[PDB]
Amino acid sequence: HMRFGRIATPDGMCFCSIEGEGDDVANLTAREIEGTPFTEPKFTGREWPLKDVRLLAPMLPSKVVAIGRNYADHVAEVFKKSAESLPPTLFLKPPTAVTGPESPIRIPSFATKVEFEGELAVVIGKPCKNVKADDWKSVVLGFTIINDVSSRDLQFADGQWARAKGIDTFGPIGPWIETDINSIDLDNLPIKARLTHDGETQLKQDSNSNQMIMKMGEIIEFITASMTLLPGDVIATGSPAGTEAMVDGDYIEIEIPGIGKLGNPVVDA
Amino acid sequence: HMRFGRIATPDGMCFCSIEGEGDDVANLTAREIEGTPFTEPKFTGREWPLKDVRLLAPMLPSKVVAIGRNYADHVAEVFKKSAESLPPTLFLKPPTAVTGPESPIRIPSFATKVEFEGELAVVIGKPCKNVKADDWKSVVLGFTIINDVSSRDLQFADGQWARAKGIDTFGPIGPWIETDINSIDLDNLPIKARLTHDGETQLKQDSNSNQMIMKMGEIIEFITASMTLLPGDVIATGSPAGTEAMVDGDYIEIEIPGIGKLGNPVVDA
Numbered sequence: 034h035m036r037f038g039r040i041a042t043p044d045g046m047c048f049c050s051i052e053g054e055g056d057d058v059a060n061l062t063a064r065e066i067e068g069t070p071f072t073e074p075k076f077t078g079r080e081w082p083l084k085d086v087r088l089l090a091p092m093l094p095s096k097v098v099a100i101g102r103n104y105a106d107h108v109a110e111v112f113k114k115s116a117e118s119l120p121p122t123l124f125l126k127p128p129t130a131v132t133g134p135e136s137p138i139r140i141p142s143f144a145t146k147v148e149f150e151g152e153l154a155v156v157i158g159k160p161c162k163n164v165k166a167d168d169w170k171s172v173v174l175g176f177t178i179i180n181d182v183s184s185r186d187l188q189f190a191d192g193q194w195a196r197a198k199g200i201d202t203f204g205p206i207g208p209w210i211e212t213d214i215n216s217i218d219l220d221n222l223p224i225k226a227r228l229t230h231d232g233e234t235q236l237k238q239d240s241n242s243n244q245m246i247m248k249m250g251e252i253i254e255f256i257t258a259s260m261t262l263l264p265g266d267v268i269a270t271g272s273p274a275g276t277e278a279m280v281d282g283d284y285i286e287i288e289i290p291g292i293g294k295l296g297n298p299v300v301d302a
Numbered sequence: 303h304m305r306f307g308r309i310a311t312p313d314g315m316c317f318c319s320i321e322g323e324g325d326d327v328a329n330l331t332a333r334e335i336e337g338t339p340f341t342e343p344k345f346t347g348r349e350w351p352l353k354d355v356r357l358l359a360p361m362l363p364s365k366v367v368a369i370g371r372n373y374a375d376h377v378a379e380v381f382k383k384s385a386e387s388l389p390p391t392l393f394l395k396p397p398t399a400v401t402g403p404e405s406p407i408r409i410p411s412f413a414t415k416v417e418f419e420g421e422l423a424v425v426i427g428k429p430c431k432n433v434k435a436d437d438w439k440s441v442v443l444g445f446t447i448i449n450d451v452s453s454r455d456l457q458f459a460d461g462q463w464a465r466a467k468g469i470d471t472f473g474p475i476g477p478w479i480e481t482d483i484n485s486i487d488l489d490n491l492p493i494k495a496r497l498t499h500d501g502e503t504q505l506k507q508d509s510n511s512n513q514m515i516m517k518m519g520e521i522i523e524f525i526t527a528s529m530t531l532l533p534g535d536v537i538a539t540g541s542p543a544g545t546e547a548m549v550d551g552d553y554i555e556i557e558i559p560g561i562g563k564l565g566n567p568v569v570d571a
């Protein structure tokens with residue numbers, strides 16, 4: 034039922050549990066675990082307070098499998114078409130896209146109209162194939178947040194979204210993995226995003242997972258019909274409406290209550 | 303200048319050097335190395351006739367990055383449009399699609415008009431980013447073959463090719479990595495594919511890497527401008543014309559002279 038993370042120390046890296054109230058690192062402690070999150074936790078006895086170390090992406094996924102066009106109004110705002118013509122579709126982000134909390138989103142000069150995309154993410158906890166929708170929870174280790182960073186201009190030019198969504202640092206994940214799955218109600222879970230631009234912060238996405246076109250069980254069944262998923266794999270369940278372009282100097286913060294906050298500065302590469 | 307393989311032995315799995323005449327297996331010998339293909343090879347002294355062991359995909363890549371629409375006539379046959387309007391484009395195949403020589407291509411019943419795609423592949427030797435086109439050889443471990451298996455029906459219906467190209471087993475690779483890079487002339491390298499159907503074998507693809515729209519250096523530069531590549535990563539350079547659908551019971555065999563042959567049976571899953 035813990036929250037699992039990865040940290041870097043003046044020493045070296047490790048998995049950890051994160052303990053402390055709500056979510057403000059100054060109030061947070063990281064307790065080293067012996068192995069990986071995939072078996073009952075062997076704690077070392079070592080802890081640092083979170084402020085004293087650096088939170089990383091909580092996992093190094095073999096792959097990042099994403100559902101595109103899973104929120105009707107997001108389809109509308111991005112493609113300027115109603116969702117009926119443009120159904121949810123599977124795509125991949127490379128592991129090299131992955132980055133952690135507070136890490137910069139590094140935009141290359143050829144990547145324009147780059148938007149954030151706050152999304153609920155699911156971390157797989159066991160090898161699985163041909164999973165039935167209603168059995169979905171059986172394969173999930175926990176929930177986390179992803180920012181599915183996307184160059185709109187590349188998406189449109191390229192046709193295949195892969196490059197547009199797969200540039201280095203285009204996949205912030207974190208801040209940790211919430212394994213208390215039943216604390217999270219998919220029929221009622223808010224997804225928010227706040228963009229700081231020119232020193233001023235505004236609410237951009239403000240929706241709920243209950244707006245998903247393809248529901249959680251359906252997603253897992255859909256994916257695993259085609260591909261085997263492994264422990265550590267991440268599934269991005271789609272972005273709600275409200276996304277917009279970012280530039281050097283901005284800061285973007287995704288919030289999912291019950292999980293926490295995922296924040297990143299934005300810079301030119 | 304060795305040829306590197308991976309094998310499952312009546313012991314375990316290991317990296318090996320492949321020695322002998324031919325690109326035929328009863329004439330060949332697998333020589334165990336202690337480490338991996340990325341450092342200086344140390345032979346353990348264990349050796350096996352290649353016919354007695356199982357040849358695996360020669361690498362477990364972190365990612366497989368593919369250039370689509372890199373052969374003009376292939377664009378024509380597949381999309382029914384001239385290549386001018388549909389330029390080369392980057393996509394990804396999941397590591398779970400990867401399989402080895404002689405291992406079955408397992409077609410799920412929902413995947414139809416599933417075609418082979420023989421392609422030259424490149425295996426990355428060192429970590430790299432922002433590589434310049436004429437510096438490409440510097441980042442390459444060697445060459446292998448890939449079969450970029452693709453459900454044409456899914457490609458069209460889905461829009462994003464990921465699922466269509468990413469189903470488990472849809473990415474045979476091998477039979478080994480040829481490190482003698484300069485023994486291969488990219489201005490003149492035949493690429494062939496022979497399909498066995500109902501007991502008859504026919505030459506289907508019969509082209510040359512000199513038909514590539516984006517050249518090798520350009521490919522590496524294009525990819526690494528966006529994505530860090532790591533040792534072991536595989537780059538699929540595109541398929542020539544001549545591809546067609548396979549069904550249960552077929553056997554498909556890709557040949558790239560100077561490299562060898564990559565053969566796989568096809569079965570209904």
Ligand SMILES: O=C([O-])C(=O)[O-]
Pocket residue numbers: 100101102103104107150181271272
């Ligand atoms: O297409 C997407 O990536 C989405 O809808 O989240």
Ligand SMILES: O=C([O-])C(=O)[O-]
Pocket residue numbers: 368369370371372373376419450539540541542
């Ligand atoms: O589209 C592809 O994958 C290709 O052209 O090889």
Ligand SMILES: [Mg+2]
Pocket residue numbers: none
């Ligand atoms: Mg400004």
Ligand SMILES: [Mg+2]
Pocket residue numbers: 099100101102150152181269271272
């Ligand atoms: Mg998305």
Ligand SMILES: [Mg+2]
Pocket residue numbers: 368369370419421450538540541
């Ligand atoms: Mg291909």
